[PDB]
Paper text:
The viral genome is encapsidated in a sheath of oligomerized copies of the nucleoprotein N, forming a ribonucleoprotein complex termed nucleocapsid. The nucleocapsid is the template for transcription and replication by L, which is also dependent on the obligate polymerase cofactor, the phosphoprotein P, together forming the active L/P holoenzyme. In oligomerized and RNA-bound N (N-RNA) the nucleic acid is threaded along an extended groove in between the NTDs and CTDs of laterally connected N protomers. An important function of the C-terminal domain of P in nsNSVs is to bind to assembled N-RNA, forming an N-RNA/P complex.
We decided to apply this to two neighboring N protomers of a 10-mer, following 5-fold symmetry expansion and local refinement. We observed that local refinement of an N-RNA dimer yielded higher quality maps as evidenced by the improved anisotropic displacement parameters (ADPs) of the model, especially in the NTD region. Variability analysis of the dimer revealed a notable motion, especially of the NTD, given by a marked transverse tilting movement of N by ~4°, with respect to the center of mass of the protomer. The tilting motion occurs around a pivot point between NTD and CTD of N. As a consequence of the motion, the NTDs globally move away from each other by ~2 Å (maximum displacement up to ~5 Å at the periphery of the NTD) at the endpoint vs. the starting point of the variability component. While the importance of the N-terminal and C-terminal arms of N has been well established in this role, we observed an additional mechanism of lateral N-N interaction. In all frames of the variability component, the loop ranging from residues 232-239 of the Ni protomer inserts into the neighboring Ni-1 protomer (red loop in Fig. 2C). The loop of N is hooked into position from the top and bottom by residues P308 and R27 from the Ni-1 protomer, with residues S243 and E241 providing additional stabilization through H-bonding. Mutagenesis of P308 to alanine resulted in a notable decrease of polymerase activity, while the R27A mutation nearly abrogated polymerase activity, suggesting that the N-N interaction via the 232-239 loop may be involved in controlling nucleocapsid assembly. In summary, our data point towards a critical lateral interaction between N protomers via insertion of the loop from residues 232-239, which stays consistent throughout the motion of assembled N protomers. Our data also suggest that residues P308 and especially R27 play a key role in this lateral interaction.
Author numbering:
A (entry chain B), B (entry chain A): 3 to 99, 112 to 365
Write the structure that this text describes.
Amino acid sequence: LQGIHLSDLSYKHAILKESQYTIKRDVGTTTAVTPSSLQQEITLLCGEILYAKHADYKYAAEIGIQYISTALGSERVQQILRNSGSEVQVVLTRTYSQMLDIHGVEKSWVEEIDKEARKTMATLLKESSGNIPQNQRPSAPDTPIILLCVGALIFTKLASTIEVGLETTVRRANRVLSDALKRYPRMDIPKIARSFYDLFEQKVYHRSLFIEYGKALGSSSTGSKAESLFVNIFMQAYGAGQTMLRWGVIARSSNNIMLGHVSVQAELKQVTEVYDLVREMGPESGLLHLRQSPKAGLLSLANCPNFASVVLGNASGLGIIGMYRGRVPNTELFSAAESYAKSLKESNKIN
Amino acid sequence: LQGIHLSDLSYKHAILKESQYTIKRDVGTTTAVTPSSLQQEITLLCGEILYAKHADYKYAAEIGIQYISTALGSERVQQILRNSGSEVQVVLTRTYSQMLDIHGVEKSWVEEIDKEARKTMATLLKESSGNIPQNQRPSAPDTPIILLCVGALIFTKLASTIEVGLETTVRRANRVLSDALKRYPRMDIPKIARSFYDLFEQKVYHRSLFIEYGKALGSSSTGSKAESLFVNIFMQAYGAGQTMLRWGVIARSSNNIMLGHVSVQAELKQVTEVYDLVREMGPESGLLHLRQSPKAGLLSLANCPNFASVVLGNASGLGIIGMYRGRVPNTELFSAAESYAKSLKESNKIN
RNA sequence: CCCCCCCCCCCCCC
C-alpha cells in the first residue's frame, strides 16, 4: 500500500526537459526587423494605420512587430528569435524615397497607407480651422502602443477560436481603448485584430518576440500611459490556455462539498501532481499555451475527468463559467457541484 | 487539497523583473539641462516667475527642472535620464546678452518673464517707500524651491485627474505655501500648477528626475525650510495610485466584521499575495504609479471585488472615503461594512 | 490530443 507509487508526470516532464538535442525549425525562412534608429519612422506608420480608413490592413500586425523590433533592437530581436527555437534569419529594413521598406511587407501597401493618411489629414485640416492637437496626429508617440494594444487584446484570446477572439477584442477595445477611439475615430479594430491573429498563427516566433517585448516594457522604470495599458493587457494574457487550473484553485477556495466525493478523492493525487509540475516549471508555466510550447498539455487536467466535472460545476454555480465550452465528463457531479455552489453563493455568512 | 495552489502574481512579477533585454524609447529626442555653474542665474529666473503677474506661465515647470539639474549636476541628470529607460540626449544650457538660452524654452518667453519682473519691481520701488526686504526680491535663494513646491503639490496628484489635481493644488497651496504667498503677493499657483502637470504628462522621465531630486534632498544633512517643505510634500506623494492598499490595511486595523464574510475570506489569499508582492518590491513600490512604471497594476486589488467593496465600505463608515471615485462592486457588502464602521466609530470603547 | 469564460489601471484628505 505504502510503496505503490508511480510519479508519471514528473518523469514525463523530466523526459521532455532533459533533451540534449535541439530541433531546428523554420530553417530556410527569413523575417523582418527595423533597427532602433528608425523608431521615429515606424512611429509614423503605426499611426497612419490608425487615424485613416484603409481598404486593407493586411500587414498592420507586422508593423507593430517592427515597432517592437525598434524598441528592443535588431541584434536583440535576432537573439530572441534564435533562442525561440526557430532558425529564422533576420532582414533589416531600409528607408528610401522618405518612406520605409520592410522585408515581406510590400511597398504598395506602405505607399497606399501613407497616401490614405495624407489625404485624410488634408481633408481634416482644410475643412477645419487648422487646429489639430498633438494626440490627434499620426506623429504621436503612443500610436504604435495603440496598435500593439489591439494586438495584445487579440493575444489574450489566442487559445480560443478566431471568431470568439475577434468578438472579445472588439468588445474590450471599445472600452479599454476608448481614449484612442476618441483621438483616432477611423481605426478599424476588427481588421487590425484579425491581422494580428493571422500573424500570431502564421509566425509563432513572433509570439516569443511579443512576450520579450512585454517583459522588457514591464521591467522599465517609466513609461507612457499606453505602455502601462499594454502591460496590463499582456498580464491579462498570462494564464491563457490553463483556465482549468485557475478554476480548480477556485473550487478549492469555494470549499465545494463534492470535492470530497469518492472519484474526486481518487483523482486528487494526479491533480496535485499537475500543480506540482506547474510549480516546478515556475514562472514560465503560464506562457506555455501562449508560446504554443509543445511542453503544454502536461498541465492539462483532462485525464482526471471527475475533478474537472466538479470544478466546472462549482464555476457554473458561482456564475463564473460564462460561455466556456469545455466538456463536462460526468453530468451528475457537475449538477450537484453547481447546486452546492449556488447554495453557498446565495447565503451570506460571517465566520 | 493542500497542493491545489498556483501563485500567479509572483510568477507575473518574476517574468516582468527577470528580463534580459532593455527597452529603448525617445531615441531621436533631446532635453535641456542647466549646469550647476548657472544655478545663481536660474534662481533669478525661478523667482522672476513668482512675484510678477505673467500672461504666459508655459515653461515654469521646465525652469524648476532646470534648477533641479543645477542642483544634481548635468552629468548626474543625464545618468538619471538614461537609467529611467529613456534615451533622451541631454542638451546643455548657455548664456547670452545676461540671460539663459534653455533648449526647448523659447528665448521670447525668457525675455518676457524677465521684462515683466523688472517692470513690476520698478513699479513697486517707485511708488513704495523703497524698503524691499531680502525675501521679497526675485533673487531670493528659496524661490526655485518655492516653485518646486507647487510642482510637488501637483506631483502628489498625478494619479488623479487634471481638474482635481489643479483644484487640490490651489486649495493646499493657499495654506502650505502661505509664507511664500505673503512674500510674493502675485504668484499664480493655478497656472504654475498647470505648467507642472503638462511637464509631468509630456516628459515622463522628468518624473524620475523629480524623484531623484526628492531623494537627494531628503538625504541631505541640512536644509532650509523650503526644502523641508518640499520633502514633506514629496513624501505625502509616496503612496500615490495605491490608496486601496492603504485602505485595506486600515480595514484590517479597524477589525471590520464583514472581513470575515465568506467571499472576503475566499479572496483573502490572493489579497495577501498582493501584499507579499508589495513587500517583495520593497521601497520602490510606492513610486510605481508616480513614475508610471508599467509594472504598476500588479498591485491592483481589482481582482478581489468583494474585498475592495468591504474596504470601501469601511472607509465610508469611518469618513475616510471622502469623495473617492472608485467603484463598489458588491453594494450589499459595501453598505454592511459602512454600517458596521459607523457603528464602531460612534461607540467609544476603551480597554 | 489539447484548448475554449470574463476582465486595463487610477481616482478622498493631509
